[PDB]
From Swiss-Prot, chain A:
This is DNA repair protein KRE29. The chain holds residues 196 to 464 of 464 of the full protein. The keyword Cell membrane does not apply. It is found in: Nucleus; Cytoplasm. GO terms for biological process: chromatin looping; DNA repair; double-strand break repair via homologous recombination; regulation of telomere maintenance. One of its GO terms (cellular component) is cytoplasm. Component of the Smc5-Smc6 complex which consists of KRE29, MMS21, NSE1, NSE3, NSE4, NSE5, SMC5 and SMC6. Interacts with NSE5. Keywords: Cytoplasm, DNA damage, DNA recombination, DNA repair, Nucleus, Phosphoprotein. The keyword Nucleus applies. The gene is KRE29. Its main location: nucleus. Acts in a DNA repair pathway for removal of UV-induced DNA damage that is distinct from classical nucleotide excision repair and in repair of ionizing radiation damage. Functions in homologous recombination repair of DNA double strand breaks and in recovery of stalled replication forks. It comes from Saccharomyces cerevisiae (strain ATCC 204508 / S288c). One of its GO terms (molecular function) is ATPase inhibitor activity.
From Swiss-Prot, chain B:
Keywords: Chromosome, DNA damage, DNA recombination, DNA repair, Nucleus. It comes from Saccharomyces cerevisiae (strain ATCC 204508 / S288c). It is found in: Nucleus; Chromosome. Acts in a DNA repair pathway for removal of UV-induced DNA damage that is distinct from classical nucleotide excision repair and in repair of ionizing radiation damage. Functions in homologous recombination repair of DNA double strand breaks and in recovery of stalled replication forks. GO terms for biological process: chromatin looping; DNA repair; double-strand break repair via homologous recombination; regulation of telomere maintenance. InterPro entries: DNA_repair_Nse5/Nse6. Its main location: nucleus. This is Non-structural maintenance of chromosome element 5. The lineage of its organism: Eukaryota, Fungi, Dikarya, Ascomycota, Saccharomycotina. GO terms for molecular function: ATPase inhibitor activity. Component of the Smc5-Smc6 complex which consists of KRE29, MMS21, NSE1, NSE3, NSE4, NSE5, SMC5 and SMC6. Interacts with KRE29.
UniProtKB/Swiss-Prot annotation, chain D:
It is found in: Nucleus. Disulfide bonds: none annotated. Acts in a DNA repair pathway for removal of UV-induced DNA damage that is distinct from classical nucleotide excision repair and in repair of ionizing radiation damage. Functions in homologous recombination repair of DNA double strand breaks and in recovery of stalled replication forks. The chain holds residues 285 to 399 of 402 of the full protein. This is Non-structural maintenance of chromosome element 4.
Swiss-Prot record, chain E:
The gene is SMC6. This is Structural maintenance of chromosomes protein 6. Present with 339 molecules/cell in log phase SD medium. It is found in: Nucleus; Chromosome. ATP binds at N20, N21, G22, S23, G24, K25, S26.
Length: 249, 488, 418, 115, 353
């Protein structure tokens, strides 16, 4: 609701970041094609992340300590388009595999948090530039380390900025898929999990397996259980999205 | 079906009536979700109706920082964990990049032309004054009884008000360089990006207007076909005939060069009430550096200038444009007497140092030479670098003549009496040379290069020893270490 | 001026200027009967609005609109309603007019910002009260619904039986209605005062309990209880006397109301049965008289084969039509208006009611009658005195404002051959 | 046959002709009945409301119903607005009164069509 | 499923045994109304059940065949594959009321059973009820008509009542909180028999305490519920009235018309902005007449039943004031809108063929 993994927890190191802007802003018209001494205050990726406002050892979500339920923690964060600009320097294309995987993991975990996304620019050019550096197969196999089954909440946060991953992650989570989807639906339906089911509806629709149109019995299962009229706040929105998506071609 | 009009297929009438009824029922969340749910999925290209273009222009004008309670009271659940305004702007910019591709390899030509028709009809309503009619018939639309959307009235019904479409450009240019959060936020997420889209659409309606106006027409009448041009009426908003001393002072409003305008600064007021007020239940999160503050404000000022010489290049050599009464030279010298007059050299550089070098051609390497010519009037000449833009030998001969002419070196023995201004003058006069140089390399892809190299080496050594003879504890503004590194 | 068969108070011809659909078009009516026909939404059922306005009437008697100036065509300035009516040999005491002219024209010109504008009687300036009194002295009362039934007044006429009885009494004898409503009010006063006396008796008995249960303080309260009992024992006889007075009032009310109402209802019942037996079905009317007089009502039984809740709308409409036919001889107006009444009900009863009204309206010494219908059914019963006027929306007038010689276009029943 | 509006069109553009002209003196009449003599008028009212009959009174006096036959062009970018302005060219609305006694007077002009 | 299949009449109104108005038009509707758990008082065609019996008999019974063979069936393993419910009315004693299975074994002679099988009742779905809608109405009449048709007014009204309860509960807890202060104040007043009086004041204070938290706990849960209910009522009012909006515009295109219907909530009207083929501006509802009134009327009809997912729809006597020339067009609109639906059986009844 209000607590969505907030990847940046501590405050940002604004003075050093401003100084490193002052150094980088002249780094654009003397190079631009050839590959850095403008940044040495952060010799390693972990140093840059720490300067950003990230804590130690930070790259995983495991859910034992209510990890993706941290509250606001109002620490000012840094603008994102320049954030990607400093991260892109640690690419090191011809280098070890482990550092490349660590960089991809850091990129993924900095994408899908509230602070970064809620202050995203409408341009959306840098994130795609980082995206093309990897192929979808390795990006979705060595993907976000989010639990695939239980948490679709971040599946929507992913397929709201990279829409072409729509048919890419569905065959990863559902590795026959059409009936796999319905059996997964029954698991959340016969669990009183009305909150985790909403994003489950919003995510996969539009793909090859669950298209739009008047055609699916999801509306039927959400129509049977409505007798309380006081049951849940998350049950009337779901049927509105369900019958709105039916009338689209 | 006057021009660029597209008749409706039945497969899209359903969508346009659907969205319009949704907007009628004041539930805009489902409106935005309809567009977001099928954006990058298939090759259908669900285009937004022109009247639904207008409401997104209105939803963008309403952000949380001064209306938090209303945005929550519309929808208390916040399904996508984002505000209506930011999703609106994301939808506008997403359909904006698709428009300036016309990439029919995946979409359909009919859909792409319909999208262009909708955008052009949306922007054609904005008719600036100085101080609803749906062309479709298949469906009944909104905005025919609805005037206001959640407090904020409207855009085309507001910018058409007298003394307003000149006001909001001034608002967004003045408040861009602001330290107060209520004022800075008003033109960072509200009036910077919307104005960018406005300029881009006014530049595209012009591109379509030139071709599909009058082929094989008289020049004296082709120039008259530019007085009613969309960019012409756009610049008609400037309610002065002193553009040699006004348009040079509208673009740079909050900038501080040597501002000599004894006339009072133009009165600047918000378009909508409560804009310059922060709401109690929202705390800003983004820390914008003043350098980053002024780095995204001059990229917009130049882009507004870049739309001014774009009509001016179309004006023929014989006659001059009628409606704005402007000359393609009075604003090269007008956008020079301030550019070379800057105090903060950081703003000088970030304006001249442009991140889109290819698209922002054809006028930056004209204002660069104009500024250099004006600054050599005080440093002590005819500058013909721009006419030489093709052959590098011409550049090299001209530049060696200039450096031998004592224009890049420092002044006479007066060293410490007026050091702080002389150093700024001489470092400002070098950035223009650097920019023209860069444009030279980018537009060109021998011994004269070495000649200019050692010549600038000697001049740099001279200015260094002049600084040392000035019993100065720090270095002068060197030039060579950049040139040698760029060339190699 | 072929007024050979026109009865006094009738309408000879209806011309109209600047109406919502009528810039300038003219009628020329009939003494006996006139069926108006045409397509839907063609402005045929609004010449009744024109006549209701042109006879110094109120706008609320129609129901089409709510303000007086709503009838002016949007885009125009002044609406002129110039109408002729046959002069009567009994109407006198009227200014700017003699008793010799056999045709008189009442015209009103309603402007934009002044609803209560001037009138025009024989091209003379006439005020509002004078024209109102003149139209009253033609013994034509658009107030009386049984004399003027507009499109929305069928409900107000009926379809509960109680107000049907109310309008019955209004049409037959307003004095009986005046005694009726006072009777209702006096019955209500009787009920209220009976409750008052019951409360007084209960309170009298109540204070006796304190008078008996009453400790020196007990006796002190006893004295006050006795004093209150005495003053209430004073109050009660006054209430009893007032109740006796209202009892006498209701005795008079019942002794003056019920018999005449019963007699008139029986007369209408006999006439109704005589009319409806010709139909080939059984029909009769009952005057239901409950103990609570406020629910007094007239209920008509219908039996076509051997209130607002029990009968069908068509059956109630047939009852209304045959009731109007029965009142034809009991109401002394010279022309009567019934409008749009034929809706929602079968074609057989359409034939029945149309034939009955044709037979009863065109007879000698009978008042003129107006019938309007959006459907003209095949094989209707027509009369020689009857005339037809067709009202049509359409496309092809050479404007009467351009050619007033055509202002009687298509009208052929006014041509005499020598 | 309650509606029976198209039957008039099918008799017209099968017997009269695509550009034929007939009058009150020929069509609305009926030599034996009065009901059928006014139902035809009422159906003509429907037809002219539908805008499928051309009806302009010549100065001779006789009415002229002719089948409005627009040459076949399915384009309506200006045909629709042409018709909409022709209907906006306000069409004062004919009172085509026809009475009972004179239904035998205008049979054709002197009581002869087919008694 | 759940749609009524067959109607069986036995000595009712003017029909002995069968499976113009009065001649079998309102009788079927009254039989459906009474055979579904309703009294004859709110029927206005006979104030008593015993009066509804055919004159010439003693006992009247109607057999109603529900359909229990698809989704939403009520205990298909017990009630078989076809619910059969009947009500028997005789001139004396209690009214007779039973539950019958498909084959014929009796289920339950309980009146609550009828009222739970159907609840597992809508008046609009199943003549005069139609004519009340299907007549002349104003701007602030069709809004109420549609709201009651969707049972939305009742849903909102109940929410308003519960909202008042939250206010009433909020008032009571304010009174309880004040009682804490006075009992604490009396605790200060008495601060060995007086000591006993001193202590007994505090126990009342504790009772005031304990009652207070109970009010807050109950109120908070109730207040939280209502905030959800407001949220659960607005999203059941947006997505429900909206489905009524499309089937008004997709039904208005069969006379080459265009328009919509608004749901202004501050003045509570249902203005119908319909336009013809030769108009430019959104026209009013009263200017139009005849064809543009009947076709708007019947369109306003068809839209109302769309949001409610039912399985059978019935209608009687839609010719109240629409002419036959326009009645044919209305019939065409009905057949095109309803014949294509394979999940809604239309049981409209009309005399003319």
């Amino acid at each position: 609701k209000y607590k969505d993994w907030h990847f940046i927890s501590k405050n940002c190191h604004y003075e050093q970041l401003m100084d490193l802007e002052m150094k980088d802003t002249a780094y654009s018209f003397l190079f631009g094609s050839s590959r850095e001494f403008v940044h040495l205050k952060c010799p390693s990726i972990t140093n840059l992340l720490v300067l950003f406002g990230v804590n130690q050892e930070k790259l995983k979500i495991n859910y034992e300590k209510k990890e993706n339920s941290r509250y606001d923690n109002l620490c000012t964060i840094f603008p994102v388009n320049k954030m990607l600009k400093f991260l892109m320097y640690f690419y090191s294309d011809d280098d070890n595999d482990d550092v490349r995987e660590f960089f991809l993991k850091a990129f993924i975990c900095l994408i899908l948090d509230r602070k970064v996304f809620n202050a995203m620019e409408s341009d959306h050019r840098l994130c795609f530039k980082v995206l093309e550096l990897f192929n979808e197969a390795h990006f979705i196999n060595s993907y976000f380390e989010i639990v695939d089954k239980n948490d679709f909440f971040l599946h929507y946060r992913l397929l709201q900025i990279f829409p072409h991953l729509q048919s890419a992650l569905l065959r990863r989570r559902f590795s026959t898929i059409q009936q796999n989807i319905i059996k997964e639906f029954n698991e959340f339906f016969d669990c009183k999990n009305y909150k985790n089911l909403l994003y489950f509806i919003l995510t996969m629709y539009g793909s090859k397996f669950i298209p739009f149109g008047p055609k699916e019995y999801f509306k039927d299962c959400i129509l049977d259980i409505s007798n309380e009229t006081t049951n849940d706040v998350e049950i009337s929105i779901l049927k509105g999205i369900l019958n709105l998506f039916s009338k689209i071609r | 079906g006057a021009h660029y009009f597209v008749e409706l297929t039945e497969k899209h009438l359903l969508a346009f009536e659907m969205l319009n009824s949704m907007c009628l029922l004041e539930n805009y969340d489902h409106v935005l979700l309809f567009l977001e749910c099928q954006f990058g999925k298939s090759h259908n290209l669900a285009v937004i109706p022109f009247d639904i273009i207008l409401v997104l222009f209105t939803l963008s004008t309403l952000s949380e920082y001064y209306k938090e309670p209303i945005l929550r009271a519309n929808d208390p659940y916040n399904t996508s964990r984002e505000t209506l305004s930011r999703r609106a702007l994301k939808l506008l910019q997403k359909y904006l990049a698709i428009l300036k591709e016309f990439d029919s390899e995946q979409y359909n030509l009919y859909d792409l032309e319909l999208l262009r028709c909708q955008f052009f009809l949306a922007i054609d309503t904005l008719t600036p004054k100085k101080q609803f009619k749906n062309p479709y018939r298949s469906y009944i639309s909104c905005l025919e009884q609805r005037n206001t959307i959640l407090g904020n009235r409207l855009l085309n019904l507001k910018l058409n008000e007298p003394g307003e479409f000149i006001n909001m450009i001034l608002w967004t240019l003045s408040n861009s360089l602001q330290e107060s959060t209520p004022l800075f936020l008003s033109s960072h997420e509200i009036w910077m990006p919307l104005l960018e889209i406005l300029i881009d659409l006014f530049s595209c309606r012009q591109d379509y207007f030139i071709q599909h106006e009058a082929q094989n027409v008289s020049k004296s009448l082709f120039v008259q076909r530019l007085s009613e041009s969309p960019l012409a009426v756009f610049f008609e908003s400037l309610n002065t005939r002193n553009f040699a001393n006004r348009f040079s002072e509208y673009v740079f409003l909050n900038c501080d060069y040597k501002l000599p305008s004894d006339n009072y600064a133009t009165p600047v007021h918000p378009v909508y009430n409560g804009e310059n007020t922060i709401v109690d239940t929202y705390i800003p999160t983004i820390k914008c550096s003043p350098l980053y503050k002024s780095q995204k404000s001059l990229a917009l000022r130049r882009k507004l200038i870049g739309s001014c010489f774009k009509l001016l290049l179309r004006v023929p050599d014989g006659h001059r444009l009628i409606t704005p009464r402007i000359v393609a030279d009075d604003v090269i010298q007008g956008i020079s007497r301030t550019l070379a007059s800057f105090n903060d050299i950081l703003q000088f550089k970030k304006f001249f140092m442009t991140e889109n070098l290819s698209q922002e051609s054809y006028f930056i390497p004209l204002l660069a030479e104009g500024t250099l010519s004006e600054i050599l009037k005080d440093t002590q000449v005819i500058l013909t670098l721009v006419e030489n833009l093709s052959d590098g030998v011409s550049f090299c001969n001209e530049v060696i003549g200039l450096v031998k002419s004592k224009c890049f070196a420092f002044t006479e023995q007066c060293s410490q009496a007026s050091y702080e201004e002389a150093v700024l003058n001489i470092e400002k006069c070098d950035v223009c040379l650097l920019v023209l140089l860069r444009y030279l390399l980018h537009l060109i892809g021998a011994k004269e290069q070495l000649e200019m190299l050692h010549a600038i080496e000697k001049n740099d050594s001279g200015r260094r020893q002049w600084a040392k003879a000035l019993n100065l504890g720090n270095d002068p503004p060197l030039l060579y270490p950049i040139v040698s590194q760029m060339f190699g | 001026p072929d007024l050979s068969s026109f009865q006094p108070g009738s309408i000879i011809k209806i011309r109209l200027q600047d109406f919502v659909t009528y810039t300038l078009t003219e009628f020329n009516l009939s003494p006996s009967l006139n069926m108006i026909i045409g397509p839907n939404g063609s402005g045929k059922s609004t010449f009744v609005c024109a006549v209701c306005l042109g006879l110094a009437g109120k706008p609320e008697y129609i129901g089409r609109s709510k303000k007086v100036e709503d009838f002016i065509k949007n885009g125009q300035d002044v609406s002129k309603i110039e109408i002729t009516l046959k002069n009567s040999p009994n109407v006198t005491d009227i200014e700017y007019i003699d008793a010799r002219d056999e045709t008189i024209k009442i015209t009103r010109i309603i402007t934009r910002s002044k609803r209560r504008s001037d009138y025009l009687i024989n091209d003379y300036q006439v005020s509002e009260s004078v024209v109102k009194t003149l139209v009253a002295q033609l013994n034509i009362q658009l107030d009386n619904l049984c004399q003027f039934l507009s499109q929305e007044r069928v409900e107000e006429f009926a379809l509960k039986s109680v107000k049907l009885l109310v309008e019955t009494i209004r049409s037959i004898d307003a004095s009986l209605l005046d005694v009726l409503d006072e009777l209702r009010e006096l019955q209500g006063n009787e009920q209220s005062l009976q409750k008052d006396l019951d409360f007084k008796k209960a309170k009298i008995v109540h204070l006796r309990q304190e008078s008996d249960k009453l400790d020196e303080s007990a006796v002190t309260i006893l004295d006050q209880v006795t004093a209150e009992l005495r003053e209430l024992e004073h109050t009660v006889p006054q209430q009893s006397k007032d109740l006796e007075t209202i009892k006498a009032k209701l005795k008079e009310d019942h002794a003056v109301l019920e018999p005449k109402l019963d007699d008139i209802v029986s007369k209408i019942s006999a006439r109704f049965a005589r009319l409806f037996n010709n139909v080939g079905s059984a029909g009769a009317v009952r005057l239901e008289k409950p103990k609570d007089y406020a629910e007094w009502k007239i209920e008509i039984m219908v039996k076509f084969r051997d209130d607002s809740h029990t009968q069908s709308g068509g059956e109630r409409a047939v009852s209304t039509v045959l009731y109007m036919i029965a009142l034809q001889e009991f109401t002394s107006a010279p022309f009567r208006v019934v409008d749009q009444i034929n809706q929602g009900m079968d074609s057989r009863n359409e034939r029945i009611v149309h034939k009955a009204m044709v037979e009863n309206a065109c007879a000698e010494n009978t008042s003129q009658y107006f019938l309007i219908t959006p459907k003209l059914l095949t094989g209707l019963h027509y009369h020689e005195k009857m005339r037809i006027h067709c009202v049509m929306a359409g496309s092809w007038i050479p404007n009467p404002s351009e050619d007033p010689k055509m202002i009687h276009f298509g009208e052929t029943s006014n041509y005499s051959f020598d | 046959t309650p509606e029976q509006v198209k039957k008039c069109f099918k008799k017209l553009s099968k017997k009269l002709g695509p550009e034929g002209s007939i009058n009150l003196f020929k069509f609305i009449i009926d030599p034996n009945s009065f009901s059928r003599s006014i139902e035809n008028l009422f159906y003509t009212s429907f037809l002219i409301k539908e805008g499928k009959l051309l009806m302009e009174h010549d100065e001779e006096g006789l009415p002229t119903i002719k089948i409005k036959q627009s040459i076949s062009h399915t384009d309506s970018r200006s045909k629709e607005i042409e018709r909409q302005r022709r209907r906006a060219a306000h069409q004062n609305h004919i009172i085509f009164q026809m009475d009972m006694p004179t239904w035998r007077k205008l049979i054709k002009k002197y009581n002869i069509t087919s008694p | 499923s759940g749609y009524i299949k067959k109607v069986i009449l036995r000595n009712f109104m003017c029909h002995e045994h069968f499976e113009n108005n009065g001649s079998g038009k309102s009788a079927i509707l009254t039989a459906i109304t009474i055979g579904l758990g309703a009294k004859a008082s709110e029927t206005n065609r006979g104030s008593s059940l015993k009066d509804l019996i055919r004159e010439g008999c003693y006992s009247a019974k109607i057999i109603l065949h529900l359909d229990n063979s698809k989704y939403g069936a009520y205990q298909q393993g017990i009630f078989g594959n076809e619910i059969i419910v009947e009500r028997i009315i005789k001139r004396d004693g209690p009214a007779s009321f039973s539950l019958r299975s498909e084959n014929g074994k009796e289920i339950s002679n309980k009146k609550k059973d009828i009222q739970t099988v159907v609840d597992y009742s809508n008046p609009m779905c199943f003549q005069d009820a139609a004519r009340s809608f299907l007549t002349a109405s104003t701007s602030q009449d069709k809004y109420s008509h549609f709201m009651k048709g969707t049972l939305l007014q009742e849903i909102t009204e109940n929410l308003l009542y519960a909202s008042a309860i939250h206010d009433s509960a909020q008032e009571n807890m304010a009174l309880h909180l004040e009682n804490l202060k006075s009992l604490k104040a009396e605790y200060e007043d008495a601060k060995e028999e007086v000591i006993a009086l001193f202590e007994k004041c505090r126990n009342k204070y504790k009772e005031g305490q304990k009652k207070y938290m109970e009010i807050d706990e109950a109120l908070n849960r109730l207040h939280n519920s209502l905030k959800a209910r407001d949220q659960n009522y607005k999203n059941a009012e947006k997505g429900t009235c909206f489905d009524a909006d499309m089937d008004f515009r997709a039904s208005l295109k069969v006379r080459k018309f265009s328009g919509n219907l608004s749901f202004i909530k501050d003045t509570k009207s249902l203005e119908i902005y319909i336009l013809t083929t030769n108009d430019e501006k959104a026209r009013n509802v009263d200017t139009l007449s005849g064809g543009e009134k009947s076709f708007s009327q019947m369109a306003l009809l068809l839209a109302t039943w769309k949001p409610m997912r039912s399985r059978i729809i019935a209608l009687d006597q839609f010719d109240v004031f629409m002419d036959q020339v326009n009645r044919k067009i209305g019939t065409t609109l009905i057949v095109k809108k309803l014949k294509d639906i394979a999940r809604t059986q239309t049981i409209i009844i009309t005399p003319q063929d």
